[PDB]
């Protein structure tokens, strides 16, 4: 009110909004494969000279089935991260399955040093694959050492990008540290070069109810209160909008069920108080806001009462009826009275009366009075002209 | 909440405009206060709350339809429930918009109408001007007829007939109201238009207003601060435009309805508390009385209008000159069917032989 | 024969659930009473032609035994550009996009009871040749009512093929009817079936068949080929979230008033 | 603080803000002007009907029966003094719609019939002024039975 | 025809601004109806000619 002395009445103030309590995330199960459906998983890989190339499709593109294993020393892509791979959607990934020497792992990296790799696996100028180092000695290990994984490829013609050393008798577990057989698992993939029909994996959280929480359902972010909904969605229907096209009903992606959505309870705050010098005690109420919430943020209360228009605070309910002193709503007004404290009552609509009607009864006035009653009316307001320029 | 719902930087950006929020809330605040004042002003025009006596000996009339029903927990007149039932719409807070319930509730609003009816029937206009004075209904009607230039004898000589017409008329209006619904157009129109305006306001949140999207979080999540600031800035302009427009429409409609409320109050204090002589104001035809009725967001009036029915052509003359002295009627008019001359009331054929008392002398034949 | 549509071509435009709402929508649609060419796939003549794909094509037929095994979506259908394959058997579809070189008659062609009055498979031209590929997939081994069981004609399979901005969808609805004549006067909605953003071009559309047939009795196979258009449709929702009625906003003045 | 080619942009934004405020202010203004003008017409009519002459309209010129009015110039407004007549004390009496004198019904020329309980009198309808029920007070219309 | 007279590009752009003009048409039509209603009520107060 910009004044040190407020008058008797009710005055609006800052609104009250229920704060979010936490966030909750729900997302679906197994999804579509571009990446490493099987390349990272097998007991036998293809030949080094016939380095494998697999097109992978339509199982879960899960790094939670690949990144879960702690065997890999480092799997962190230069351009992306496996942790953030959940949201990322791919177009196609190719599998480089073959067996090479333990010292030839980094030889698979782009711009490698050493011509041993080019003969068996040429490095493309635009490689997006991610070098992954995972223990693979036992899988390729042989009792006498396998020579089948030979590097006899010595074509004199130059080797192009994906157009299609032998210091050990074979791959033996007795080979020294770094000299053991190794298996290359690189997710060589292209994005937007092929049509997108795939997406990555996801993660889920727990479930809550009857709380103002932040919800994410298949990307459906928002804030509100969720509750089990008796509504019956269609088998292929997941979202529910109101007449004004506002989401009200959602279906849990993991467990089939429809949940209601309700905006977090809120409403205006109005302060009831008599004149300052009459008393410094004040009565505060929340408009259309139940006091099931009010202890959020004097929050103790100890003097509360629910009303159709709201659940006020600080005023003591009175079951008698008196003349309205300060309008509140739903036929409730508050006043300061006896020790003196603000009270709330119901409309004493007036002096109940019963005129003695009868068939042959007349009440003629025997006397009169002259009464002068004032009356005021606006006539004109101060004129005003504004010089635009 | 509506503009930058749960977005601090959005709210911080809006602070540039600053005070705009305060005026809009104040404008609406005034409107809300006006609504309660209007309803209270038109209805709460009785110091006391009179009650209808249990003995309904109103000279043969029945008012059961308009009288409250004690058995009904909502002590409303039967018509009121009919009016309440006919009015048909949801609307709840979604994005900051809220609805403030009216200060008065239909339960007590009905009491005003109940008390007003009792005072009217049991005390006529006396309670309007001050202390309520009981008056037998039959006599009260006689006073009304005197107001419209009809002598009391007409009412008493045909009291039984009038009762049947009045009671039948009340029965008829019920069925007309129950059958058709176009009568409630005005009240229904206000709700629909008011509801329609809110819907459009909410829908406007979906428009990008030339921005990349209409979802603030999406813009915030994607774009970096500088670019995101520009996008939201445009969104603030568009959203702010919608609010000030809607509030303006609310102000105009509130301005119009307020005038209607004042008109209702003028009818309320004149067509009910008294017998207005304004032709066609309190219903078509000559006016006798009125009965208010509480309806949602509005009010319904029951004008009781007198109407001449059957006419017979007569031969008349301005005056009569008896002994060289002209005679003029004290009231009414001279009329002869063609054989004898009669004087009768201006609005009912009650022939009476012309006599000295019924007339007065002035001038002579020639003038 | 240019037969006329009555109420078909209605499908849910979104997964959104609306109850007792007269939601209005703008999208590719089959205009009400917009008439559609009729094709009778014959077995001495033949009526299995190549038709354009004008950004949304509606299909419906009363066939049985999956005589129309599937369809071919692509640009060239000659392995110059990747082409789709929709051939479906009693088990499932084998959706396939590859640089595929087809043939003049690239369907399996079960010519049962045709000439020698028996059952046989004289060719397997479905896989003419897949020179090279970019993606392939076989849907879930379901069992949908595609085999030969007429009884009272109920195999009213409606297909709408929408491939917008790289997302390709499939809406259909098994429509059990009793009238064996031209499309009955009924209202139904094609529920979404599958989305597969194959991203390929499509601007042409040859269907597939399952059955030198000179003198052989004609083929009791018939179907419709409608084309959706971008139109504003006033759509109904019952208490269920099911489309009970629909109205076009440009068919006639009366409908436009409803839309307005 | 800024060279021309970008300074107008900042200027342009300010123009929109200030111009928008003027519209809000001006748009807000004339709405009140219509309201007060509507109120003014109400006041003018009250002056014409409650001051220049007595008005029979009930409660329009003050509470209760209206006798006359007096205005008073006030800053930007007008103040009325509604001199109203109000009954004070009422003692109710038994009545009768008509009097059967000699088989012919009688009704008052004006007023109303009342009785202390023994005799009967007729008096005006807004102040107890009993009088003997004579022929001049009343008039004949029909017979008693009806 | 006032804002984006005969320009689909302009017509598409205003669509991003909600349906502001749609309210304007409704208000204007309401004004037009009021005029006809006003004229009828003030004059046509007697049915018989
Ligand atoms: C409502 O009001 C009154 C109720 O009392 C009724 O009218 C009254 O009736 C009585 C009798 O008719 C009137 O009494 C009159 O009093 C006069 C004054 O003297 C009185 O006091 C002395 C004191 O010693 C007594 O000795 C004396 O007897 C009186 O009691 C007397 O002078 C009167 O006597 C004679 O004159 C009057 C008038 O000429 C005659 O009517 C008498 O019959 C008698 O011959 C008389 O006694 C009293 O004044 C009346 N008051 C009124 C009219 O206001 C009404 O009937 C009742 N109204 C109705 C409609 O019913
Ligand atoms: C969408 O919801 C509607 C229901 O409004 C549903 O259409 C069917 O309509 C009837 C009523 O209109 C539904 O029956 C009602 O609900 C139950 C089940 O029927 C009962 O309380 C009542 O029916 C009883 O009485 C019938 C008398 O013949 C019995 O036959 C019956 O078995 C019950 O005992 C009441 O009338 C009916 O449930 C729905 N059908 C279904 C499947 O809900 C429509 O099918 C629903 N569609 C979807 C996709 O949800
Ligand atoms: C215009 O109005 C006139 C109203 O008076 C009509 O004249 C009257 O017509 C009636 C016809 O019934 C007549 O009454 C006759 O019957 C009555 C039955 O009770 C009786 O009471 C009447 O007695 C009167 O007349 C006799 C003489 O015959 C007198 O001795 C009586 O004292 C009494 O006055 C009676 O005859 C009315 O009498 C008669 N009124 C007069 C003054 O004559 C006109 O007919 C009518 N004209 C037109 C064109 O409409
Ligand atoms: C995705 O993976 C989860 C992993 O469980 C699947 O969970 C579904 O929901 C709950 C999870 O606790 C399970 O249902 C339970 O079934 C037992 C059976 O005895 C029953 O007693 C419980 O009351 C509860 O219903 C179950 O794992 C599974 N529910 C099913 C299959 O009906 C989920 O189904 C997987 N699929 C999707 C789309 O999320
Ligand atoms: C807070 O607001 C609500 C009004 O919406 C008031 O309490 C509500 O009253 C009923 C009865 O308890 C509850 O409905 C149902 O009650 C049954 C009782 O068995 C219960 O089993 C159901 O789960 C359901 O609650 C309703 O939930 C309840 N809502 C609340 C408490 O939020 C209440 O007056 C208000 N709290 C106050 C005034 O402190
Ligand atoms: C008073 O107003 C009431 C109506 O509010 C009038 O009373 C009428 O009385 C009759 C008989 O009770 C009702 O007729 C029928 O009564 C039977 C038995 O209850 C019922 O089953 C029928 O459906 C029908 O109601 C009638 O309903 C009722 N209303 C009307 C319009 O006639 C009465 O005429 C008024 N006058 C008096 C002196 O009460
Ligand atoms: C009253 O009378 C007029 C006309 O007088 C009628 O004709 C006279 C010759 C004489 O017989 C009177 O008693 C009659 O009443 C009526 O008006 C005319 O009615 C006729 C049909 O009856 C019609 O052709 C005319 O157009 C009407 N107008 C005129 C100027 O003649 C009138 O109906 C009667 N009104 C009442 C209340 O009785
Ligand atoms: C009105 O008079 C009644 C009773 O007074 C008696 O009867 C009258 C008809 C009249 O003839 C008086 O001169 C008599 O002395 C007063 O008492 C009321 O009576 C009615 C029932 O008869 C009852 O319902 C009321 O409750 C009674 N009220 C009181 C205070 O007793 C009544 O006070 C007088 N005033 C009014 C406004 O009615
Ligand atoms: C049509 O012919 C039979 C019917 O089941 C299936 O053809 C082969 O079925 C076996 C499994 O029993 C699969 O291993 C083959 O891959 C199927 N062949 C092909 C080309 O897919 C098949 O179900 C039907 N053909 C389909 C679905 O394309
Ligand atoms: C794939 O991973 C599983 C679980 O870690 C493992 O048991 C298995 O050895 C791997 N599969 C093959 C064929 O090696
Ligand atoms: C302050 O005190 C006096 C009463 O003693 C007074 O006139 C005034 O009403 C009080 N302040 C208010 C807001 O009432
Ligand atoms: C008030 O009085 C009513 C009597 O009906 C009683 O039910 C109620 O408990 C009382 N409440 C208080 C606070 O006194
Ligand atoms: C099909 O549509 C066009 C235009 O309505 C019409 O000219 C033609 O006759 C129609 N033919 C059939 C079979 O509907
Ligand atoms: C029937 O069998 C003969 C045997 O060769 C074969 O030539 C002929 O094509 C068959 N007819 C059909 C319709 O398959
Ligand atoms: C398929 O093989 C061809 C020809 O050798 C080659 O050009 C192309 O890269 C491969 N992929 C296709 C045609 O999709
Ligand atoms: C499809 O888009 C690709 C990309 O240019 C192009 O190669 C092909 O010719 C297009 N074909 C059609 C029918 O649009």
mmCIF file of C-alpha atoms in Angstrom, chain A residues 244-342:
data_model
loop_
_atom_site.group_PDB
_atom_site.id
_atom_site.type_symbol
_atom_site.label_atom_id
_atom_site.label_comp_id
_atom_site.label_asym_id
_atom_site.label_seq_id
_atom_site.Cartn_x
_atom_site.Cartn_y
_atom_site.Cartn_z
ATOM 1 C CA UNK A 244 -8.223 -25.982 -24.363
ATOM 2 C CA UNK A 245 -5.692 -28.582 -25.593
ATOM 3 C CA UNK A 246 -3.736 -28.866 -22.347
ATOM 4 C CA UNK A 247 -2.317 -32.213 -21.271
ATOM 5 C CA UNK A 248 -4.367 -33.708 -18.445
ATOM 6 C CA UNK A 249 -3.938 -37.477 -18.823
ATOM 7 C CA UNK A 250 -0.762 -39.429 -19.584
ATOM 8 C CA UNK A 251 0.071 -43.123 -19.893
ATOM 9 C CA UNK A 252 3.148 -44.591 -18.235
ATOM 10 C CA UNK A 253 5.493 -45.905 -20.965
ATOM 11 C CA UNK A 254 6.823 -48.757 -18.824
ATOM 12 C CA UNK A 255 3.680 -50.109 -17.140
ATOM 13 C CA UNK A 256 0.459 -49.680 -19.099
ATOM 14 C CA UNK A 257 -1.733 -47.312 -17.084
ATOM 15 C CA UNK A 258 -3.252 -43.837 -17.471
ATOM 16 C CA UNK A 259 -2.337 -41.162 -14.926
ATOM 17 C CA UNK A 260 -4.122 -37.876 -14.319
ATOM 18 C CA UNK A 261 -2.299 -34.539 -14.384
ATOM 19 C CA UNK A 262 -3.269 -31.650 -12.109
ATOM 20 C CA UNK A 263 -1.409 -28.317 -11.914
ATOM 21 C CA UNK A 264 0.304 -27.673 -8.603
ATOM 22 C CA UNK A 265 -2.138 -26.037 -6.208
ATOM 23 C CA UNK A 266 -1.829 -22.261 -6.030
ATOM 24 C CA UNK A 267 -3.856 -19.136 -5.428
ATOM 25 C CA UNK A 268 -3.771 -15.521 -4.425
ATOM 26 C CA UNK A 269 -2.868 -14.355 -0.932
ATOM 27 C CA UNK A 270 -5.157 -11.755 0.640
ATOM 28 C CA UNK A 271 -4.492 -10.142 4.018
ATOM 29 C CA UNK A 272 -7.455 -9.246 6.232
ATOM 30 C CA UNK A 273 -6.790 -6.724 8.981
ATOM 31 C CA UNK A 274 -8.618 -3.936 10.834
ATOM 32 C CA UNK A 275 -7.260 -0.408 11.024
ATOM 33 C CA UNK A 276 -3.641 -0.258 12.119
ATOM 34 C CA UNK A 277 -4.294 1.546 15.391
ATOM 35 C CA UNK A 278 -7.275 -0.672 16.215
ATOM 36 C CA UNK A 279 -4.872 -3.626 16.357
ATOM 37 C CA UNK A 280 -1.662 -4.834 14.746
ATOM 38 C CA UNK A 281 -2.953 -8.407 14.513
ATOM 39 C CA UNK A 282 -3.733 -9.504 10.962
ATOM 40 C CA UNK A 283 -5.660 -12.304 9.276
ATOM 41 C CA UNK A 284 -4.192 -13.880 6.137
ATOM 42 C CA UNK A 285 -6.038 -16.198 3.762
ATOM 43 C CA UNK A 286 -5.319 -18.128 0.579
ATOM 44 C CA UNK A 287 -7.949 -17.772 -2.136
ATOM 45 C CA UNK A 288 -9.297 -21.116 -3.288
ATOM 46 C CA UNK A 289 -6.174 -22.711 -1.795
ATOM 47 C CA UNK A 290 -6.635 -25.431 0.800
ATOM 48 C CA UNK A 291 -4.526 -25.200 3.965
ATOM 49 C CA UNK A 292 -3.418 -28.779 3.352
ATOM 50 C CA UNK A 293 -0.630 -26.848 1.570
ATOM 51 C CA UNK A 294 -0.202 -23.688 3.662
ATOM 52 C CA UNK A 295 2.445 -25.073 6.091
ATOM 53 C CA UNK A 296 4.847 -24.908 3.124
ATOM 54 C CA UNK A 297 5.680 -21.286 3.959
ATOM 55 C CA UNK A 298 4.139 -18.490 10.543
ATOM 56 C CA UNK A 299 3.629 -21.782 8.720
ATOM 57 C CA UNK A 300 2.795 -23.303 12.117
ATOM 58 C CA UNK A 301 -0.683 -21.777 12.158
ATOM 59 C CA UNK A 302 -2.465 -23.033 15.303
ATOM 60 C CA UNK A 303 -5.540 -21.011 14.226
ATOM 61 C CA UNK A 304 -6.962 -22.127 10.877
ATOM 62 C CA UNK A 305 -10.379 -22.597 9.311
ATOM 63 C CA UNK A 306 -11.526 -23.929 5.942
ATOM 64 C CA UNK A 307 -13.977 -22.009 3.766
ATOM 65 C CA UNK A 308 -15.433 -22.512 0.309
ATOM 66 C CA UNK A 309 -13.368 -19.529 -0.846
ATOM 67 C CA UNK A 310 -10.290 -20.793 0.994
ATOM 68 C CA UNK A 311 -8.677 -21.795 4.272
ATOM 69 C CA UNK A 312 -7.753 -18.591 6.083
ATOM 70 C CA UNK A 313 -5.233 -18.269 8.917
ATOM 71 C CA UNK A 314 -5.069 -16.273 12.133
ATOM 72 C CA UNK A 315 -8.809 -15.661 12.541
ATOM 73 C CA UNK A 316 -10.973 -17.661 14.935
ATOM 74 C CA UNK A 317 -14.148 -19.119 13.458
ATOM 75 C CA UNK A 318 -17.379 -18.108 15.199
ATOM 76 C CA UNK A 319 -20.569 -20.123 14.776
ATOM 77 C CA UNK A 320 -22.845 -17.135 15.444
ATOM 78 C CA UNK A 321 -23.983 -14.604 12.838
ATOM 79 C CA UNK A 322 -23.180 -10.893 12.682
ATOM 80 C CA UNK A 323 -23.263 -8.093 10.139
ATOM 81 C CA UNK A 324 -20.561 -8.276 7.490
ATOM 82 C CA UNK A 325 -17.573 -6.078 8.307
ATOM 83 C CA UNK A 326 -15.035 -7.122 5.651
ATOM 84 C CA UNK A 327 -16.034 -9.213 2.603
ATOM 85 C CA UNK A 328 -14.112 -12.456 2.153
ATOM 86 C CA UNK A 329 -16.133 -14.740 -0.101
ATOM 87 C CA UNK A 330 -18.830 -17.401 -0.025
ATOM 88 C CA UNK A 331 -20.840 -15.351 2.448
ATOM 89 C CA UNK A 332 -18.101 -14.967 5.070
ATOM 90 C CA UNK A 333 -16.873 -11.713 6.611
ATOM 91 C CA UNK A 334 -14.363 -11.034 9.373
ATOM 92 C CA UNK A 335 -14.398 -8.500 12.193
ATOM 93 C CA UNK A 336 -12.378 -7.551 15.266
ATOM 94 C CA UNK A 337 -14.088 -8.365 18.560
ATOM 95 C CA UNK A 338 -13.577 -9.867 22.004
ATOM 96 C CA UNK A 339 -9.116 -10.607 24.442
ATOM 97 C CA UNK A 340 -9.937 -8.805 21.206
ATOM 98 C CA UNK A 341 -9.153 -10.913 18.142
ATOM 99 C CA UNK A 342 -10.261 -11.176 14.532
#
